[PDB]
Design a protein around this ligand. Structure first.
Ligand SMILES: Cc1cc2nc3c(=O)[nH]c(=O)nc-3n(C[C@H](O)[C@H](O)[C@H](O)COP(=O)(O)OP(=O)(O)OC[C@H]3O[C@@H](n4cnc5c(N)ncnc54)[C@H](O)[C@@H]3O)c2cc1C
Ligand SMILES: Cc1cc2nc3c(=O)[nH]c(=O)nc-3n(C[C@H](O)[C@H](O)[C@H](O)COP(=O)(O)OP(=O)(O)OC[C@H]3O[C@@H](n4cnc5c(N)ncnc54)[C@H](O)[C@@H]3O)c2cc1C
Ligand SMILES: NC(=O)C1=CN([C@@H]2O[C@H](COP(=O)(O)OP(=O)(O)OC[C@H]3O[C@@H](n4cnc5c(N)ncnc54)[C@H](O)[C@@H]3O)[C@@H](O)[C@H]2O)C=CC1
Ligand SMILES: NC(=O)C1=CN([C@@H]2O[C@H](COP(=O)(O)OP(=O)(O)OC[C@H]3O[C@@H](n4cnc5c(N)ncnc54)[C@H](O)[C@@H]3O)[C@@H](O)[C@H]2O)C=CC1
Lengths: 471, 472
């Protein structure tokens, strides 16, 4: 038996960052993790492995395809060694999970390996796999249990032939034909990876656009068109009726128009189900404790991230807001800062979103649909990467930067990027929004030449003054 | 056949062509005069554009030919260099972009005059074509954007064949077996890297004790140098080249010695790259008759509206004081023209970033530790290595760090220095931060997307502000 000031259940982005920050703040900190490694979804079956595969597959594409040759890099033959590519992936995951073990040690956070359950308003009991337990009496409890894949009823995931993103990140062979349910972020990212390695990919989507919630429709549309030219096929506004695994090993996927009718069947070698994720809170002790979940399974919390019980908090994927890793970490940090007395404030309008395909997609702030729905009078500035010096020099010119500015004050209301370097570029945009900067502000900042950031600068100039210089 | 205008821009490089476009968009009847066969000045034709094309292609060659792709399961038979094809990619880009300026001039009503321009009156410019033909332009204002030229090394004459300036270095016909570079400045390091990557044995000889040129932070420079040396790039610091001579052999012997004197010796190479700097170009512009005197470095003195001694005659870009960079010239051109239209004119050279496009890249804006020291500014430091950055680790590109310098009391960011992947792009968020007078805390508190290289920027500010970053 042992005690602490703060007990965080979960070693994911929200959890481990919170543990560390609480420790650095002067709290006696304990972190409970049920899995064999720290890092949660992001490190082990999420962010890290997916980006590694996105990265390696893109490079395979450049070598195997036409890009490298056009640059004077001639190679007789280019073959995929999926075993070694997955190896690179695993190496990154092993190194980063180790890093957290080292960081906990460095900040003297204590690692309790086991399945935690809140056994008392000031206690958490960690029951290992061998039944051997451990008790932790603490002043505050921080729930950072995260999420799990959202199952598709009627279809049972077996991570072999019918998989979730977890199975898809470790496919043993490039599937010949792959069907993806859900043309969201995972769908487009994992679909793209396997499409590049040689699979024939079709994403089936219930809604009428790709990219998930909050993406700007014009950007979503241009993105789809580019992916389609890459080989990626889409069936939008389509519902999946069901799926059956056949004795020959193939999988039949029944579909129909979302508005009924147009029955069809798609046959594939691998089915990837990715229609979202949901908060994971089972056997945590909330029903017992009195913590009622909302209809969607999230733990309700106030502006300081505390539950019904004033000393029990919840952050990350287990609570409302975008289910993203940087969002979970920020909440962890501010939640424990709040525990130490500081103010606690987060503005989800300033949390960016990134899609790590190629081209990448990234945005922060409002989409045009949001502004029209809100009756906002705004201005639009667009700048194609085809007119950007660095993009043209690199011979990688798909897409554009689109800026939405308030008509009255020129304040940047939304930044949307489709193209090279979008993921890094959106952070200059997040910073701008944090200060309430104007389109003109950005346009007058001296950006390095030649860089992709200049497309960003010119789109702001266009939004502000009406015309950019290079287009 | 005289033509008239409100603004006549002499020169079509970054400064000039942007100023011409901006002036036209503001409503001025605008003329842009260029003596070369194409538009775009140094940057587009023999500078920024072709060097970045080669830097990009040579890096990819390295990733393929070397061990990188192999480590990712991308197995290749025999990676080979088709120098002709690679030079073609570089050229296709230069042609496309230069043609783009011509189209933008047309779209914006800018009148392009081909010929060597000379100010022949307070309100007149005459452009003389190759065929001796003449075009006169009566104009309300004159904007000198004549740029620069390579600084010659006395005693060594460049022939763009075996003894080259950056221009010949950008079009070498074959990979040199051995190459020596005079000057470990930005060009020396970038082009030296290009050729090194393509198979050349490269050594840069530098008179000073560090690589990277003026302004680079010393800690950053030494870390950069060490990383380059691990790549095979050789350096002879605090060493001066006393001369070069070409043998019947075809090779060239370079006599060098300690910068202070003595230690004399000779080294030999196939190609000699002379890049000891660039200088303002104002030749035969008519400045002497106008009474417009140059400063000691050959630059045109201008006031805060970029006006020369004669108020309706202006100068911007490489011909005037400040960093000789393309973005600097472009900004000076825009604000200069905005001023001509009565608006405020403001530029703070402390917020003009600098980038070195090697791999890893180097980027900075604001002050270096040495500048803050000589200025007496009390400051604190925040560092974060790319080895602890998630995007950097997953991509196996972990060299470097971000270093933030904040004012000890106010926590205001005073300087940002980045060594590693994505530096060139990342420095722009830093520049936005400096413009706003951000504090290290302001930065650490903005939500940066995970996983991005930019998180290193965030963490380093967190370290400078709070004392510790989260992931290191
Ligand atoms: C394939 C994929 C790719 C992704 N890519 C990105 C990306 O590029 N960028 C981004 O921002 N987001 C990405 N995400 C989403 C991101 O991973 C999640 O938003 C993030 O991990 C949420 O963090 P968290 O700390 O709240 O929860 P999680 O990381 O889901 O979980 C934290 C930990 O809680 C543990 N836990 C749960 N209950 C208990 C208990 N009772 N006792 C002990 N331990 C417990 C879990 O085992 C887990 O390790 C991706 C997700 C997937 C699936
Ligand atoms: C190899 C190399 C790489 C570089 N890389 C970068 C980089 O990555 N980033 C960066 O910011 N900077 C870089 N630079 C520097 C950058 O190119 C210059 O700072 C920039 O071109 C300056 O712009 P400018 O408009 O003042 O002058 P310039 O572009 O030098 O010249 C403008 C024009 O003036 C014309 N002209 C001159 N006199 C007359 C006359 N009398 N009549 C008519 N026309 C005339 C010239 O022919 C030229 O076309 C690089 C330079 C070199 C040499
Ligand atoms: N790069 C990044 O930032 C990444 C973030 N993530 C995040 O992880 C979480 C889960 O990702 P996803 O599973 O992709 O969720 P998502 O919401 O991004 O995409 C799910 C897709 O499935 C569609 N859908 C839902 N039900 C359906 C049905 N019955 N039939 C057909 N289509 C249906 C949704 O409209 C959506 O297009 C999200 O928060 C996502 O943003 C995941 C990968 C990468
Ligand atoms: N990536 C970018 O932004 C790039 C910018 N440029 C710019 O173009 C201009 C010129 O660049 P560079 O030619 O590299 O000049 P530089 O100033 O960057 O470097 C010239 C070097 O020559 C050294 N030197 C001088 N005399 C010497 C001698 N006799 N022996 C040995 N060394 C000697 C100087 O110490 C200096 O280090 C600069 O403004 C530079 O910033 C050039 C290339 C790239």
């Amino acid at each position: 038996p042992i005690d602490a000031d703060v007990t965080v259940i979960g070693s994911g982005p929200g959890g481990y960052v919170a543990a560390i920050k609480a420790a650095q703040l002067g709290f006696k900190t304990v972190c409970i993790e049920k899995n064999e490694t720290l890092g949660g979804t992001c490190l082990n079956v999420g962010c890290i492995p997916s980006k590694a595969l996105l990265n390696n597959s893109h490079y395979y594409h450049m070598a195997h395809g036409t890009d490298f040759a056009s640059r004077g890099i001639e190679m007789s033959e280019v073959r995929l060694n999926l075993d070694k590519m997955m190896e690179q992936k695993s190496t990154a995951v092993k190194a980063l999970t180790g890093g957290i073990a080292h960081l906990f040690k460095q900040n003297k956070v204590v690692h309790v390996n086991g399945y935690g359950k809140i056994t008392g308003k000031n206690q958490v009991t960690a029951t290992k796999a061998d039944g051997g337990t451990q008790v932790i009496d603490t002043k505050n409890i921080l729930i950072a249990t995260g999420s799990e894949v959202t199952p598709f009823p009627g279809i049972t995931i077996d991570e072999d032939t019918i998989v979730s993103s977890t199975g898809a990140l470790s496919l043993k062979k490039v599937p010949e034909k792959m069907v993806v349910i859900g043309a969201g972020v995972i769908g487009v990212e994992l679909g793209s990876v396997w499409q590049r390695l040689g699979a024939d990919v079709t994403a089936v989507e219930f809604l009428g656009h790709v990219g998930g919630v909050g993406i700007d429709m014009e950007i979503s549309k241009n993105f789809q068109r580019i992916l389609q030219k890459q080989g990626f096929k889409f069936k939008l506004n389509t519902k999946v009726t069901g799926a059956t695994k056949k004795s020959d090993g193939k999988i039949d996927v029944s579909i129909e128009a979302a508005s009924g009718g147009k029955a069809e069947v798609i046959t594939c070698d691998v089915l990837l189900v990715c229609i979202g994720r949901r908060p994971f809170t089972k056997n945590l002790g909330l029903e017992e404790l009195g913590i009622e979940l909302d209809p969607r399974g999230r733990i309700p919390v106030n502006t300081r991230f505390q539950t019904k019980i004033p000393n029990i908090y919840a952050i990350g994927d287990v609570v409302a807001g975008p289910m993203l890793a940087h969002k979970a970490e920020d909440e962890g940090i501010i939640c424990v800062e709040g525990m130490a007395g500081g103010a606690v404030h987060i503005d989800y309008n300033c949390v960016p979103s990134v899609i790590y395909t190629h081209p990448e997609v990234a945005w922060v702030g409002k989409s045009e649909e949001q502004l029209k729905e809100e009756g906002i009078e705004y201005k639009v500035g667009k700048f194609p990467f085809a007119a950007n010096s660095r993009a043209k020099t690199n011979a990688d010119t798909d897409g554009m930067v689109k800026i939405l500015g308030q008509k009255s004050t020129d304040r940047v209301l939304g930044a949307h990027i489709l193209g090279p370097g979008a993921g890094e570029m959106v952070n200059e945009a997040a910073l701008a929004l944090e200060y309430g900067a104007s389109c003109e502000d950005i346009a007058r900042v001296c950006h390095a030449h030649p860089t992709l950031s200049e497309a960003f600068r010119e789109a702001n100039l266009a939004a502000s003054f009406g015309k950019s210089i290079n287009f």
